[PDB]
């Protein structure tokens, strides 16, 4: 039941949801 | 990707395409003239895009 599909200690990576 | 296919699925196994995120003008269907039915039901064909 797909309905959306997409394809595109030194580093800090910081995300928001 | 529907239309310009070499090859359909039968009557009972009908091929069901689920789309979103996609952009179409629907003017080419009005300019395809190789269309025998063309039979819209729900919304009027003209104000659909």
Same mark, same amino acid.
């Given at each position: ?17 | 990707?529907?239309? !310009?296919?070499?090859?359909?699925? *039968? %009557? ?8 979103? !995120?996609?952009?179409?003008?629907? *003017? %080419? ?14 919304? *009027? ?5």
């Amino acid at each position: 039941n797909c309905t959306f599909e997409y394809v595109s200690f030194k580093n800090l990576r910081e995300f928001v949801f | 990707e529907v239309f !310009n296919a070499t090859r359909f699925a *039968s %009557v009972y196994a009908w091929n069901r395409k689920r789309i979103s !995120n996609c952009v179409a003008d629907y *003017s %080419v269907l009005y300019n395809s003239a190789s269309f025998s039915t063309f039979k819209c039901y729900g919304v *009027s064909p003209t104000k659909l895009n």
